[PDB]
């Protein structure tokens, strides 16, 4: 019954150490198992150990948290632009000409011949059937007596002041005269 003794005070777990380990530290002390890197979670039962605000950390860890991180970054830039050149054009023209007109001249001419026409039928007369009579020309076929109708030739024909007839007509028309005659009367007797 009578017993107690002494021990340490674990300011970590808040339990009194029954004199066994009572790990001491900078103005502090915790149980052995208690004294464990609260970072890596690995027990810390050796030197090279560090402490911290109500906590314990192994050197390394300490140098890890305390240690730096690294460097930052930088930057850059750049730009450029240019352009030019443009020109073009052209033009032209032309004229024209004309052409006037010139008048014309006249000429002369003349030429005649023989031959004639048929004043009877009306057609023309030139050889083949051309007759000349009464100082006129006509078709030897048409050329006939304008009294009997009997066709003529030239001589046998008779040109009466333009007119044309047959000798028989030219003669008769202008025939000679003839003597006349009469009758007498004998005598007889009567009886019964
Ligand atoms: Zn403890
Ligand atoms: Zn650690
Ligand atoms: Zn004729
Ligand atoms: Zn006749």
């Amino acid at each position: 019954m009578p017993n107690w003794g002494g021990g340490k005070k674990c300011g970590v777990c808040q339990k009194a150490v029954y004199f066994a380990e009572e790990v001491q530290c900078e103005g502090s002390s915790f149980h052995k198992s208690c004294f464990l890197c609260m970072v890596c979670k690995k027990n810390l039962d050796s030197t090279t150990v560090a402490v911290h605000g109500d906590e314990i950390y192994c050197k390394s860890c300490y140098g890890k948290k305390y240690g730096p991180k690294g460097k930052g970054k930088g930057m850059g830039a750049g730009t450029l632009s240019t352009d030019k050149g443009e020109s073009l054009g052209i033009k032209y023209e032309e004229g024209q000409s004309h052409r006037p007109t010139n008048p014309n001249a006249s000429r002369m001419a003349q030429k005649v011949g023989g031959s004639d026409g048929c004043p009877r039928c009306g057609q023309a007369v030139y050889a083949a059937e051309k007759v000349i009579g009464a100082g006129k020309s006509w078709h030897k076929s048409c050329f006939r007596c304008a009294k009997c109708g009997k066709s003529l030739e030239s001589t046998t024909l008779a040109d009466k002041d333009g007119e044309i007839y047959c000798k028989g007509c030219y003669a008769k028309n202008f025939g000679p005269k003839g003597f006349g005659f009469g009758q007498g009367a004998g005598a007889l007797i009567h009886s019964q």
Side-chain angles (χ1 to χ4, degrees):
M1 242 185 196
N3 242 313
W4 243 34
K8 265 259 190 68
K9 67 210 102 180
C10 186
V12 149
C13 61
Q14 210 128 328
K15 234 149 184 84
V17 191
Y18 56 92
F19 256 105
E21 297 301 343
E22 53 281 340
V23 172
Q24 66 104 347
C25 227
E26 208 121 20
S28 68
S29 59
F30 332 123
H31 292 92
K32 184 139 275 237
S33 251
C34 274
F35 203 114
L36 162 146
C37 186
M38 276 253 149
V39 183
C40 52
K41 221 123 175 202
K42 203 248 271 255
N43 233 93
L44 276 166
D45 40 87
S46 79
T47 58
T48 81
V49 70
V51 195
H52 206 242
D54 207 315
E55 233 59 275
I56 106 176
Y57 307 134
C58 66
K59 165 247 255 169
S60 176
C61 280
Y62 210 87
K64 240 159 148 109
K65 289 279 267 289
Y66 279 59
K69 246 160 215 202
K71 270 232 164 171
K73 272 103 153 209
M75 222 112 81
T79 181
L80 194 90
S81 192
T82 183
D83 80 85
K84 228 264 146 134
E86 65 227 272
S87 64
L88 91 308
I90 197 128
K91 248 171 120 287
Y92 78 121
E93 67 257 320
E94 227 190 278
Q96 214 116 258
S97 69
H98 279 264
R99 211 228 200 283
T101 187
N102 221 72
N104 266 298
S106 300
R107 256 224 150 204
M108 244 111 224
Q110 240 149 82
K111 252 140 135 85
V112 298
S115 83
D116 320 308
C118 185
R120 194 74 241 205
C121 54
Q123 248 283 107
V125 175
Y126 175 53
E129 57 250 335
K130 168 163 129 291
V131 71
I132 299 88
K136 262 256 179 252
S137 44
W138 358 41
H139 297 122
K140 204 220 277 77
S141 78
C142 313
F143 207 44
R144 64 223 249 160
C145 175
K147 245 271 103 207
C148 50
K150 226 209 138 94
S151 277
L152 326 138
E153 222 243 313
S154 51
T155 289
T156 62
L157 112 88
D159 47 20
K160 232 280 241 139
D161 279 280
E163 297 113 76
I164 73 165
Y165 309 102
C166 67
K167 209 141 129 84
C169 272
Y170 205 41
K172 269 81 195 264
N173 278 47
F174 321 132
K177 66 230 188 145
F179 278 68
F181 68 114
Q183 65 105 34
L188 51 283
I189 63 84
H190 254 166
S191 242
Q192 195 248 104

